[PDB]
Amino acid sequence: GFTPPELDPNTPSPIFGGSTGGLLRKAQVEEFYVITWESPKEQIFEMPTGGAAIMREGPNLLKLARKEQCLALGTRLRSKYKIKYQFYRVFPSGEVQYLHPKDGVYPEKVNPGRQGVGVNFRSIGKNVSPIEVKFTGKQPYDL
Amino acid sequence: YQVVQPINGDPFIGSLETPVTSSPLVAWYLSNLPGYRTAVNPLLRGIEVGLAHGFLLVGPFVKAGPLRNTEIAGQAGSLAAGGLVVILSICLTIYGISSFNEGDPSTAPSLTLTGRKKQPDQLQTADGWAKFTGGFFFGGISGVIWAFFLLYVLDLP
Amino acid sequence: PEVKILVDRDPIKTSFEQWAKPGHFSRTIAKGPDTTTWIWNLHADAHDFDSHTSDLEEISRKVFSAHFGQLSIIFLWLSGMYFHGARFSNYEAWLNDPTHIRPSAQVVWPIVGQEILNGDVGGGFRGIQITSGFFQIWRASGITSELQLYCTAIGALVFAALMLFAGWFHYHKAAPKLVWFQDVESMLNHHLAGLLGLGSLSWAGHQVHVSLPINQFLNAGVDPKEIPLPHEFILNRDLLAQLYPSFAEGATPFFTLNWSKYADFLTFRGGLDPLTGGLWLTDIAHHHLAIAILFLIAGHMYRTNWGIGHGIKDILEAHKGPFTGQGHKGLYEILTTSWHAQLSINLAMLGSLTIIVAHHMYAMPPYPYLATDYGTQLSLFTHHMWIGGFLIVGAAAHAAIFMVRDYDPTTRYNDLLDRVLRHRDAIISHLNWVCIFLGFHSFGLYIHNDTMSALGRPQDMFSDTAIQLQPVFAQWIQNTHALAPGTTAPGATTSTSLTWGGGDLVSVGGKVALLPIPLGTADFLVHHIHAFTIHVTVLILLKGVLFARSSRLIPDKANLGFRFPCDGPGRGGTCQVSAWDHVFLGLFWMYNAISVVIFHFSWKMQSDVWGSINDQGVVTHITGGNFAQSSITINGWLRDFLWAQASQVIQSYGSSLSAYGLFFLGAHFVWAFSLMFLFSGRGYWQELIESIVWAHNKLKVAPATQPRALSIVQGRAVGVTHYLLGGIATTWAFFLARIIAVG
Amino acid sequence: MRDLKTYLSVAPVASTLWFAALAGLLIEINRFFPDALTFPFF
Amino acid sequence: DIAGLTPCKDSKQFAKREKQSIKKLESSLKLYAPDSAPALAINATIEKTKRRFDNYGKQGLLCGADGLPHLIVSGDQRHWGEFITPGILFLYIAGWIGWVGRSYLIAIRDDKKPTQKEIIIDVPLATRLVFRGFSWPIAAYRELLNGELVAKDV
Amino acid sequence: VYFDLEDLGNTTGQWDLYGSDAPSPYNSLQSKFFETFAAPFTKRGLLLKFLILGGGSTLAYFSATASGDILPIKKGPQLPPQLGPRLG
Amino acid sequence: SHSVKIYDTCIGCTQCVRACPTDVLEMIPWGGCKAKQIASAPRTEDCVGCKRCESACPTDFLSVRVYLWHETTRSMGLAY
Numbered sequence A: 001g002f003t004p005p006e007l008d009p010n011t012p013s014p015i016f017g018g019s020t021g022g023l024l025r026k027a028q029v030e031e032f033y034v035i036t037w038e039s040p041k042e043q044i045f046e047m048p049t050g051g052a053a054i055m056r057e058g059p060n061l062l063k064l065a066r067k068e069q070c071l072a073l074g075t076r077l078r079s080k081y082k083i084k085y086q087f088y089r090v091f092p093s094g095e096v097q098y099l100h101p102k103d104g105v106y107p108e109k110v111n112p113g114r115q116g117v118g119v120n121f122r123s124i125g126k127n128v129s130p131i132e133v134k135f136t137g138k139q140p141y142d143l
Numbered sequence B: 001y002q003v004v005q006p007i008n009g010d011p012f013i014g015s016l017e018t019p020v021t022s023s024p025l026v027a028w029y030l031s032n033l034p035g036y037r038t039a040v041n042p043l044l045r046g047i048e049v050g051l052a053h054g055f056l057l058v059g060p061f062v063k064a065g066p067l068r069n070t071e072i073a074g075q076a077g078s079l080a081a082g083g084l085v086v087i088l089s090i091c092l093t094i095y096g097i098s099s100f101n102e103g104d105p106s107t108a109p110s111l112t113l114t115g116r117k118k119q120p121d122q123l124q125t126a127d128g129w130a131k132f133t134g135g136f137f138f139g140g141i142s143g144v145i146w147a148f149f150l151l152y153v154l155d156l157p
Numbered sequence C: 001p002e003v004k005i006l007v008d009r010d011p012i013k014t015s016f017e018q019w020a021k022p023g024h025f026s027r028t029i030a031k032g033p034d035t036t037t038w039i040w041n042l043h044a045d046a047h048d049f050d051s052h053t054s055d056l057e058e059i060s061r062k063v064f065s066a067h068f069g070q071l072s073i074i075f076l077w078l079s080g081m082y083f084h085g086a087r088f089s090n091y092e093a094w095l096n097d098p099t100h101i102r103p104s105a106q107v108v109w110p111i112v113g114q115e116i117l118n119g120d121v122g123g124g125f126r127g128i129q130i131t132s133g134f135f136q137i138w139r140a141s142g143i144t145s146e147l148q149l150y151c152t153a154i155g156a157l158v159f160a161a162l163m164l165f166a167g168w169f170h171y172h173k174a175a176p177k178l179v180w181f182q183d184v185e186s187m188l189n190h191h192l193a194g195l196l197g198l199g200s201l202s203w204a205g206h207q208v209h210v211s212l213p214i215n216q217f218l219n220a221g222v223d224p225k226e227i228p229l230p231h232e233f234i235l236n237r238d239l240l241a242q243l244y245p246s247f248a249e250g251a252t253p254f255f256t257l258n259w260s261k262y263a264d265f266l267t268f269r270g271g272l273d274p275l276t277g278g279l280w281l282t283d284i285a286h287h288h289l290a291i292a293i294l295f296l297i298a299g300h301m302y303r304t305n306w307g308i309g310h311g312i313k314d315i316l317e318a319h320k321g322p323f324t325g326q327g328h329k330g331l332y333e334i335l336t337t338s339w340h341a342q343l344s345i346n347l348a349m350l351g352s353l354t355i356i357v358a359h360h361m362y363a364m365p366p367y368p369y370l371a372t373d374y375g376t377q378l379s380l381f382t383h384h385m386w387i388g389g390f391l392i393v394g395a396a397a398h399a400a401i402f403m404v405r406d407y408d409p410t411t412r413y414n415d416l417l418d419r420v421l422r423h424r425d426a427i428i429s430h431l432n433w434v435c436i437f438l439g440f441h442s443f444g445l446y447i448h449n450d451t452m453s454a455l456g457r458p459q460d461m462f463s464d465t466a467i468q469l470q471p472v473f474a475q476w477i478q479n480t481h482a483l484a485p486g487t488t489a490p491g492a493t494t495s496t497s498l499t500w501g502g503g504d505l506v507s508v509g510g511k512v513a514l515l516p517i518p519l520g521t522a523d524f525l526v527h528h529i530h531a532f533t534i535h536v537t538v539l540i541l542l543k544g545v546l547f548a549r550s551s552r553l554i555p556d557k558a559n560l561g562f563r564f565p566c567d568g569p570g571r572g573g574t575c576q577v578s579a580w581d582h583v584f585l586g587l588f589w590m591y592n593a594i595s596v597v598i599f600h601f602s603w604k605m606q607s608d609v610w611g612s613i614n615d616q617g618v619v620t621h622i623t624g625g626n627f628a629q630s631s632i633t634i635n636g637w638l639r640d641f642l643w644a645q646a647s648q649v650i651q652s653y654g655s656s657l658s659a660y661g662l663f664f665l666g667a668h669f670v671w672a673f674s675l676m677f678l679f680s681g682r683g684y685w686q687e688l689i690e691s692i693v694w695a696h697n698k699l700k701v702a703p704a705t706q707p708r709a710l711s712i713v714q715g716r717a718v719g720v721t722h723y724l725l726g727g728i729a730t731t732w733a734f735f736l737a738r739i740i741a742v743g
Numbered sequence D: 001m002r003d004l005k006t007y008l009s010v011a012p013v014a015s016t017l018w019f020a021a022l023a024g025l026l027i028e029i030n031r032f033f034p035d036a037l038t039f040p041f042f
Numbered sequence E: 001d002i003a004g005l006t007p008c009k010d011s012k013q014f015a016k017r018e019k020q021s022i023k024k025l026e027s028s029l030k031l032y033a034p035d036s037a038p039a040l041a042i043n044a045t046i047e048k049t050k051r052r053f054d055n056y057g058k059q060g061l062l063c064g065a066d067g068l069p070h071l072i073v074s075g076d077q078r079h080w081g082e083f084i085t086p087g088i089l090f091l092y093i094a095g096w097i098g099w100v101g102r103s104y105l106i107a108i109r110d111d112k113k114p115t116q117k118e119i120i121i122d123v124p125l126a127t128r129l130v131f132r133g134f135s136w137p138i139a140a141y142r143e144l145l146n147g148e149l150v151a152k153d154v
Numbered sequence F: 001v002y003f004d005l006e007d008l009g010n011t012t013g014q015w016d017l018y019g020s021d022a023p024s025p026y027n028s029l030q031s032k033f034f035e036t037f038a039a040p041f042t043k044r045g046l047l048l049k050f051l052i053l054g055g056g057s058t059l060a061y062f063s064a065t066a067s068g069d070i071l072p073i074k075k076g077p078q079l080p081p082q083l084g085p086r087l088g
Numbered sequence G: 001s002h003s004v005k006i007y008d009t010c011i012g013c014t015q016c017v018r019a020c021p022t023d024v025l026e027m028i029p030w031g032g033c034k035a036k037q038i039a040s041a042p043r044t045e046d047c048v049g050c051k052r053c054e055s056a057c058p059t060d061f062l063s064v065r066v067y068l069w070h071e072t073t074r075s076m077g078l079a080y
C-alpha cells in the first residue's frame, strides 16, 4: 500500500532568470509536467532546457514541458546530488496525475505490488508469421 | 541592474522580456494596431488591415511587373495587387473555415498580463473571423483602388 | 604567483614495450580486437588525449610534445622543398628569365611511361611545373645558387631533428608542470614580443642586408653569378652604399632620430614595382620593422613577476554591463582549464587569418614575378581558402567538444555563456530566417535570370543592361582607397593596391599583373551568394554547439557524448542530433561555400584581370570580359565556365598535363564513391557481410577478428571524407590544367 | 629488442614492407621487360 | 584474320602510329642540345618505342582498323599468350596467396588469442608457410579429395 | 503565485500580451459605413464562392481578351518561319 | 503508442528500466529466473521509441522489443 503525495502549490521554485527553453502553448491546452524534490541547501544545477539555475534549500517545485525532461533532471538530482524526487502530469483542467516513482519505489527495484503488462511467455523467435494474423486486427507480438 | 528579465516574472514560461518585447513604446504601438484591438468588431479591424495592405501591394506589382516599362498598361498593373487581395482573402476564408466551427467560443486568451480576467477577442471565432475576412477584402480592394488613383507628382510612379 | 621554469624529471620511461601493445592508451582498446571495429577505434581515439586520462598535466604534456612532432614534420617538409629546389629544379635558369621559364621542382623516373610528365618547362629542363611559389620566395630572399638552397635544406633537416628531440625530451625527461602551461601572461608576452616581434625584426634584418641589395642587382639585369654574395654587402658597406647610400652613416641617424634620412631603403610608396610586379621591398622591410616595434610593445601588456602590467582575469571581470550581467567573470578559469576551448578560438582565428591572407596576397602580390605566374597565384588563393574553411569547421567541432565535456556551471561558471544558452532558440531561429532570406534574395535572383533568358526576355533579368544591382558601397570604398594616397595617406605615393586606384595597370613580360577590378551586378549577386553560404555554414555549426548539451527533443543529450550516431528511431527519429553530426553536415557547406568562392576567383580574374597586353597597350583578357554578362545566370556558369574551361583537363592526355586529366577522373570517382556511404546504412552491409562470412566458414578461412560493417558515425566520416577529397581534387585538376595551359 | 621486432610485425608495418618489396619487384620487371601485352615465351 | 582483323605486322595504321609517335618525340628532341641529358632521355624513349611496336608486331598481335592490338581470348591456340597463358600464371599466383593465407589462419585458429596473431603477424610461422603455395594445387586437390577443404554442414 | 492548480492560464502563461482591450478609436458613421458596405462579405462560405467564381471568371476575362501588344503569345510569330536542321 | 513487450528469456538484470528515459518499464516479481524478477511495460503511452532498453538487453536474442506504432505527441517527443 502506497499513497502518492499530493502536489502542493505554493511550493517554491528554483532561482532562474528565464529561458527560451520553457513552456509553450502545449502546456496551456494539452498538458505539462511538474517535478518536486527536497534539497539540503542552495545549489547550482543544470536545467534540462535553459542553462544554470539555483536549487533552493528545502522543497523545490519545477514545471517542465515533457515527461522526459522531468525524468532527466530527476536522474541527475539522484546522481550528482543525492536527492529524492517525484513528478506528476498536469492537465489544463487542474487535474493532477502522479507519475513517478509510481510505487514510491523506483521501477528498477522489483516491488511485489506490480502487475505484468506486455509480458509474453515465450522466446521471441516463437512469434507467428504475419500471414497467420492477416486480416485479423492482431499483431504476432500482441499474443 | 539588468535589462533582460523573465516573461511576466515567470522564468519557466519559454520566453524573455527585452526592450524589443516589453517596452512602453513597443507595447503601446502593438496595442494600437488593429489586430490587437480585442474589444473592437473584427470587421473594422479587417477594414484597416485591408486598407493598409491593399494600398501597399500596388507599388511592387506596378514597378517590378512585366508591363512596368510600358507605361500605358504598367500603371494598370494594379489589377495584380487586386488579384493577390482575392487570393489572400481566399486563404483567410479557408483558414477560418478550417480553424473555427459555428458554435465554438473564442480561443483567444481571457487573461491580461497582470492576471485579471479578460473578455476574449471575437476575432478567434468563426463569425468574428468571417467578419475580419470580409473587412480585409473590402479594405484591400479599396486600398488598391486608392493607390491606383494616385499616379501623379511622385518621385517613383 | 611567481612565474618560473617548472618541470618534472623522467615521468614516462622510453621503451618499446607499449609500441608492441596496440591501444595501450585506452583500457578497452588495449585488450585487443574481438571484432574489426577495434581497428578503427584505435585510430579514431589515438589523439583524443582527454579521453585517455583525466589528469590535466598529462594531457598538457602530450599536447606539448605532439606539437614538437608536428614542427619536426614541417621542418622535414621544408627540407624537402629546399633540397628539391637545389637538386631537381630549374631555379637558376628561371632566375635568369623569369617571365618565360616555368618553375619546376620535381622530376619523375622513367619507369612505366610516366616520363611524359617531365614536360618542357624551359631552361633546357624537363619536369613538373610547380605552383607552390618557392621560386618567388627564394628570389625575394636574395637566394641565387643551388648551394644556398642545399644549406637551407640541411639547416631545416637539423631543426627537424632538434624539434623531434625536444618532443621526446619534454615528454620523457623534463616535462613541464601544469602551472607552467597555465602561465598565460608569460606565454602571450613571449609570443607577442619574443616570437612575432623578434621574428619580424630578424626578417627585416635579412631583407635590408640581403634581399634589398641582391634584388637591386637582379632588377638591374646583373647576372646572378656576378652578383656579390649576401655577406659581401655586410662586410664592405660600399656595395650597399652604392646601392643604398644611407648605409654610409653607421646607424647614427637611428639613435639621433634622423630617421627620415633612411627614406632611401625604407619607403611608404605602396603599389607595385613595375619591373617585378611585386610589392616594393623597401616598403616590405619598413613594414617588418614597424610590425616588430608594434609586437615588441604589445608583449609588455601582461604582468608576470614584477608587478607592472595587467592580469587578464582583472581585465575580463571589469567588462560587464546591463545586458550581459556579470559577463566575462569566469572565462580566465575556463581558458586556463579546457584545451578544446583554446583550440576552438585558435582554429577560428587562424582559419579566418588564412582566408585574409588569401585575399591580401593576390591583391598585393608580395613576391617578385608572382602576380604574372597565374598558376601559382590561383593555386595559392585556392589553397589558403581551403585551409581556412577546414580550420573554421574545426573550431566549431572543438567548441562543441568543450560544451559536452568541459562545461560545468556548478564549478566554472560564466554569465555570457549561460545567457547565450538561455536564448539559444532565439539565436538559431533568427539565423535560420536570415539564411532563408539570403537563399531567396541571392540564388533566387539567378533562377530569375535563367528563366527570363530562356523565355527571351533579357531586359527582364538582373543585369548591368537591364535591372542593375550595383554594389554602390563597395564601389565607394575602392574609390576612397584610390583617392587615399596624397590625401588621407600623404606619405603613400600610390594606391594601397592596384585593384583600387584607376589606371596604373602593371604588366610584366606582356602579361598583366594587376589593374582596377570592376564591380557590377554580377559581383553583387555573387557576393550575396557568399553571404548566404557562410550564414548557412554558421547556422549548422552554431546550432551544433548550442544544442550539444540538451534540447526539447533530447533533454539528456550531453550524457550521450560529443560523437554518437543518434538516440534511435523514436521521437519521430533522432539521427544526426549529435554535435559531431553537425560538424559532419557543416563540412559539406564549407565545401559548397569555398567552392563557389574559388570559382568566383578564377572566373573573375580570367575575365576582368589576367591577360596579355599589346606593345601599344591593348589588353586581351584570358576570357573576353564575359563575367558581367555570363555569370549572372546558372546556365552561364555551366557553359562559359565549367564546360569551356574544362577543355584543357579533358584534352591533357598525351602531354605533360595528363596527370591532371587522370586526377580529374579519379577525383570524380572517389566523390561518387562517397555517395555509397552517405546514402546507405550499416545494417544492410552487416547482413551482406553475414553471407560473405558464411562463404568463408565454408572453406575454413573465416578470420578470428570478426568482420563488422563500419559504425554509423564511421559511415558518415568515410562518406564526408571521400566527398570532400573527390570534389576538392576534381577542382584541383581542373584549375591546374586550365591555368597551366592558358596562363 | 623483442618488443621492437613485435612492433615491426604489426599489420601496417608488415604491409608497407611487403608491398614495398612487391612494388620494387614489379617495377624492375617492367624495367627489364617493358610494355608487353602478352606472354611471349609460349 | 580472326574477327576481320589484320596482323599488326601487315597494318598500315599500326606503322603510321609508330611513325607519328617517333616523329613526335623527335619534335621534342629538336629543342635540346644532342649531348644534353633531356636529349638522351628522349632518345631512350624513342628506342623503347621502337622496341614496343617491333615486339607487338613480332609476337603476332592482330590489329583493328584503329591500328591498335586487339586480344583474342576465344582460346584460339595462336593467341594463348594474350590470355590463357598469363591467366594460368595468375591463377597459380592467386591460388598461392589464398592457400598460404588459409594455412596461416588454420595454424593460428587454436591459439589462446587468435586475433592477436591477425593484427601482429607471426612472421616465423608465415615464413614457414609461404612456400606451401608452391605446391598449393596438389595440396588443395588432395584436400578436396580427403574432405579437409570444406567445412562439414555449414 | 506563479503556480496555481486553480488558474492554469496564469500558470501556463496564457495571456494577451499586447491586446489593448480599450474601446474603439474608430469613430462611428465611419464604422456604420464599413459595417453596412462590407456586410455582404462577412459570410465566409459565400465569400469563398464569390472569390473563386468571381476571381476565376475575372481571370478568364482578362485572358480571353488579352491583346498582342501585351502578350507576345497572342501577337503570334511575326517573322518568316525558319527551317529545321534537315526538315521543315 | 508504440508497443513494448517482454519475453520470458528475460533474466531480470533491470538494465532496460535503468536505460528508459521516460519510465515505461518496471521490475515485477517472477519465478522463471534466478533474479526472481522480470521486466514489464505498463506505461507505453509515454514510450518515445528510442530503443535504449534494447541497446541495454544482454539476452540473445532480445527480451525487450519496441514495435514502433501509432504516433502521438508523447511518442514524437514534442514539447510543443
Ligand code: CLA
Residues within 6 Å of the ligand: C012, C013, C014, C015, C016, C017, C018, C019, C024, C025, C061, C062, C063, C065, C066, C068, C069, C164, C165, C166, C167, C168, C171
Ligand atoms: C625515440 C624513442 C621513443 C620511445 C621508444 C618512446 C616510447 C613511448 N612513448 Mg614517446 N616520444 C618520442 C619518442 C619515443 N617514445 C618522441 C620523439 C616524441 C615527440 C613526438 C614522443 C612523445 C610522446 C608522447 C606525447 C607520448 C609518448 C608515449 C610513449 C609510450 C607509448 C607507446 C608509443 O608511443 O607507441 C606509439 C607508436 C608509434 C609508431 C607512434 C608513431 C607516431 C609518429 C611520430 C607519427 C608519424 C607521422 C607520419 C609521418 C604521418 C604520415 C602518415 C602518412 C604516411 C599517411 C611509449 C613507452 C605516449 C604515452 O605516454 O603513453 C601513455 C604519449 O602520449 N611519446
Ligand code: CLA
Residues within 6 Å of the ligand: B061, B065, B066, B067, B077, B079, B080, B081, B082, B083, B084, B086, B087, F051, F052, F054, F055, F056, F058, F059, F062
Ligand atoms: C500554370 C499556370 C499559370 C498561368 C496561366 C500563369 C499566368 C501568368 N503569370 Mg504565372 N506562375 C505560375 C503559373 C502560371 N502563371 C507558377 C507555377 C509560378 C511559380 C514559379 C508563377 C510565377 C509567376 C511570376 C513571378 C509572375 C507570373 C506572371 C504571370 C502573368 C504573365 C503574363 C502577363 O504579363 O499578363 C498580364 C499581367 C498582369 C499584371 C495582369 C494581372 C492578371 C489579373 C490580375 C488576373 C486576375 C487574377 C484573378 C482575379 C485571381 C486568380 C486566382 C483565381 C483562381 C481565383 C500571367 C497572366 C507575372 C505577373 O503576374 O506579373 C505580375 C509575374 O510576375 N507568374
Ligand code: CLA
Residues within 6 Å of the ligand: C063, C064, C067, C068, C071, C180, C181, C183, C186, C187, C190, C191, C193, C194, C195
Ligand atoms: C621568446 C620566447 C619563446 C619563443 C620564441 C617561443 C616559440 C614557440 N613556442 Mg613557446 N612558450 C614560451 C616562450 C617562447 N616560445 C613561454 C614563456 C611559454 C609559457 C611558459 C611558452 C609555452 C608554449 C607552449 C605550451 C607551446 C609553445 C609553442 C611554440 C611554438 C609555436 C609554433 C610556431 O610559431 O612555430 C615557429 C617556429 C620557429 C620560430 C622556430 C624557432 C623555434 C626555436 C628553436 C625555439 C626558440 C624559443 C625557445 C623557447 C628557446 C628555448 C630553447 C632552450 C630552452 C634549449 C614556437 C616555436 C607550441 C610548441 O611547443 O610547439 C612545439 C606550444 O605548444 N610555447
Ligand code: CLA
Residues within 6 Å of the ligand: C043, C044, C045, C046, C047, C048, C049, C343, C347, C390, C391, C392, C393, C394, C395, C397, C401, C563, C580, C583, C584, C587, C721, C725
Ligand atoms: C590543429 C587543429 C586541430 C587539432 C589539434 C585537433 C584535434 C582533435 N580533433 Mg579536430 N578538427 C580540426 C582540427 C584539429 N583537431 C579540423 C580542421 C576539423 C574539420 C574537419 C576538425 C574536426 C574534428 C571532428 C569532427 C572531430 C575532431 C576530433 C579531434 C580529436 C581526435 C583526433 C584523432 O585522434 O583523430 C585521429 C586522426 C585520424 C583518424 C586521421 C583520419 C584520416 C583523415 C580523415 C583523412 C586525411 C586525408 C588526406 C589528408 C588526403 C588523402 C591522403 C590519403 C589518400 C593517404 C583531437 C583532440 C574528434 C574527437 O572525437 O574529438 C575528441 C572528432 O570527432 N576534430
Ligand code: CLA
Residues within 6 Å of the ligand: C431, C432, C433, C435, C436, C437, C438, C439, C440, C443, C444, C447, C536, C539, C540, C585, C588, C589
Ligand atoms: C541543390 C540542392 C540543395 C538545395 C536546393 C538546398 C536547399 C536548402 N538547404 Mg540544403 N543541403 C543539401 C543541398 C541542397 N539544399 C545537401 C546535399 C545537404 C547535405 C550536406 C544539405 C544539408 C543542409 C543543411 C544541414 C541545411 C540546409 C539548409 C537549406 C535551406 C537554406 C535556406 C534557403 O536558402 O532557403 C531558400 C531556398 C532556396 C534557395 C532553394 C531554391 C528556391 C527557389 C529558387 C524558389 C522557387 C519558389 C517557387 C515559387 C516554387 C513554387 C512552384 C510551385 C509549383 C510549388 C535551403 C532551402 C539549411 C536550412 O535549414 O535552412 C536555414 C540547413 O541547416 N541544407
Ligand SMILES: CC1=C(C/C=C(\C)CCC[C@H](C)CCC[C@H](C)CCCC(C)C)C(=O)c2ccccc2C1=O
Residues within 6 Å of the ligand: C676, C677, C678, C680, C681, C682, C685, C708, C709, C710, C711, C712, C714, C715, C716, D015
Ligand atoms: C560500403 C559500405 C560499407 C562496407 C565497407 C567496409 C566494410 C569498408 C572496409 C573494407 C576494407 C577493404 C576492409 C579492410 C581489409 C583489411 C585492410 C585487410 C586487407 C588485406 C590487404 C589487401 C591489406 C559499410 O560498412 C558502411 C557502414 C555504414 C554506412 C555505409 C557503409 C557503406 O557504404
Ligand code: SF4
Residues within 6 Å of the ligand: C565, C566, C567, C568, C569, C570, C573, C574, C575, C576, C681, C712
Ligand atoms: S536509422 Fe540509424 S541514425 Fe537513424 S535513428 Fe535509426 S539507428 Fe539512428
Ligand code: SF4
Residues within 6 Å of the ligand: C570, G004, G019, G020, G021, G022, G023, G024, G025, G046, G047, G048, G049, G050, G051, G052, G053, G054, G066
Ligand atoms: S523505446 Fe525508449 S522510451 Fe520506449 S521503453 Fe524502450 S527505453 Fe523506454
Ligand code: SF4
Residues within 6 Å of the ligand: G006, G007, G009, G010, G011, G012, G013, G014, G015, G016, G017, G038, G039, G053, G056, G057, G058, G059, G062, G063, G064
Ligand atoms: S534488459 Fe532484458 S534481461 Fe535485462 S531486465 Fe530488461 S528484458 Fe530482462
